[PDB]
Symmetry: C2
Subunit: 127 residues, 2 copies
Amino acid sequence: GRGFEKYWFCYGIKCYYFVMDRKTWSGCKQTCQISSLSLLKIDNEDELKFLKLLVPSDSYWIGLSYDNKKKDWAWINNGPSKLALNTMKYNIRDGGCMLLSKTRLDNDNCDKSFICICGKRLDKFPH
Amino acid sequence: GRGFEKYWFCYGIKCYYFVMDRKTWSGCKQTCQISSLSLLKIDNEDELKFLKLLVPSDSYWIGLSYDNKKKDWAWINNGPSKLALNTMKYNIRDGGCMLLSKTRLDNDNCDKSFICICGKRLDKFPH
């Protein structure tokens, strides 16, 4: 259940929620999930511009990880995105999971503990 | 009816909306109202702490102005608050309306144009 911050924000059709405890990438993925949210997927450059603008200054796990079957960085659950990643920017030797900071996307050790940012669209309903 | 930013935020029981164009204090007050919002009232020190933390960096008209008849600073529509102001720090000769920045509350010419921050509780329903 719930140990989230009491603030949250929205942009367009998507809101953004913050776990209180820092967690490993996997632990964040699962914490977003038990609450019907999902570790955050970033849909485009517009959205990225806004989050870097609006998030408090820190480093946040987001739902993007390197996938050795696809041979590429992939949004969780095959999630589709229009965010172009320059994958040369990212050395998988230095980390296979993505964080958001105010300054950039960076890859990092999946075992380090960062703030989880979970997203949920406003048109997301149980099925 | 509209001319708002696409983004907004919430804390506990209250959300926060941003007008796109800078306006005079009175214009902010009326723009918030047109949309059944209200130029923002700050309820306590906890809430002020949070807003200084999450608002982009700029200066914002909020629903606080100096009242001749009360002989005091007063929140719009007789709004109740538990935010203690030290009123000795506001010279009314320098301005009779309040704005919020990241640093502090300050008073300023009610005719300057600043960003409107409109508040609305989640338990606020037509009547």
